[PDB]
């Protein structure tokens, strides 16, 4: 829930040829990190108590599956196309510069 942090190496570590006594070179490595956090997706739906008691056409059980279906499709439209992406998502596939 608090997100995660990913470490990465980056330094161009280096070494060089020498002759006898040709006093030796010096080098330094380097490091970096990226963090990411989850977003929330939600909805509410409302009915008369008589509609709930009678459950016409199995509308309640239908809605339970249909909102689940919609929530999965909202994840793809975020990650593929950026369409409604919450700002905590990083990158989307249509954002690339190769066609």
């Amino acid at each position: 829930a608090t997100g995660i942090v990913i470490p990465h190496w980056t330094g161009d570590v280096s070494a060089q040829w020498i002759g006898e006594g040709d006093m030796k070179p010096i080098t330094k490595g380097n490091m970096t990190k990226r963090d990411v956090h989850p977003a929330k997706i939600a909805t509410i739906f409302v009915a008369s108590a008589e509609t709930v008691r009678a459950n016409p056409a199995n509308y309640l059980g239908t809605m339970r599956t249909k909102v689940a279906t919609a929530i999965a499709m909202a994840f793809d439209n975020a990650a593929l196309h950026g369409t409604n992406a919450p700002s905590a998502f990083q990158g989307y596939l249509d954002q690339s510069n190769k066609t």
């Binding site: 739906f45 009915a47 009678a54 016409p56």
Partner: protein
Amino acid sequence: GFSADHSQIAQTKDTMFTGYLDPVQAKDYFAEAEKTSIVQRVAQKIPMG
């Protein structure tokens, strides 16, 4: 209350549920019994051809 098919609430009256929740067919609780002949009850029967 709310509109006949309100945009944010599901109700029994919504158009969406036509063809469900139909009223149940009862017997006729007010069936007036058939009349029948009084003449054929009082008058003397005879054979016929």
